[PDB]
């Protein structure tokens, strides 16, 4: 079952990538977000990533395609597993922690409309022991 609220949440995730609001995610829009986070996929790789979600093969992801993928992922994952996978996405180097500076960068770029003050309070709350890193334990409490 997919609630109205859940669909709206998935639309917010879709719209993060669909920055021109034209109802499709292109390779260019995917590349813009990935480059902003420090990755540099080739155009071929971006095309292959789009193709993992682009069910009708027209070269872009629309919201029915996005929703199919996101709803299936949610049904297939548990609250504990999805937080660990997300941590590993953001712990790109797999070091066991995300530095405060790295987390600030992720939050400003993915939050889009967050002020530096809001990101400040988020980082301060997340970094429980104040050592300038968010480890897995602190990430789980932040995300729970």
């Amino acid at each position: 079952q997919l609630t109205e609220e859940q669909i709206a949440e998935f639309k917010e995730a879709f719209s993060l990538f669909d920055k021109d609001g034209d109802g499709t995610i292109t390779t260019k829009e995917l590349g813009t977000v990935m480059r902003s986070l420090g990755q540099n996929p080739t155009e071929a790789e971006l095309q292959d990533m789009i193709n993992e979600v682009d069910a009708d093969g027209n070269g872009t992801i629309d919201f029915p395609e996005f929703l199919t993928m996101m709803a299936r992922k949610m049904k297939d994952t548990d609250s504990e597993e999805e937080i660990r996978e997300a941590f590993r996405v953001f712990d790109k180097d797999g070091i066991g922690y995300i530095s405060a500076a790295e987390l600030r960068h992720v939050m400003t770029n993915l939050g889009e409309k967050l002020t530096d003050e809001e990101v400040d309070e988020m980082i301060r709350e997340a970094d429980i022991d104040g050592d300038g890193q968010v480890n897995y334990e602190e990430f789980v409490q932040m995300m729970t």
């Binding site: 995730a13 937080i83 996405v89 939050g111 988020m122």
Partner: peptide
């Protein structure tokens, strides 16, 4: 990798939502 990156974005956005809702209270 692809699905996980999209789902990770959703999960951090959910964290943003809950943070804002508590700040507004």
């Amino acid at each position: 990798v692809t699905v996980g990156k999209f789902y990770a974005t959703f999960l951090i956005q959910e964290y943003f939502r809950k943070f804002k809702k508590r700040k507004e209270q």
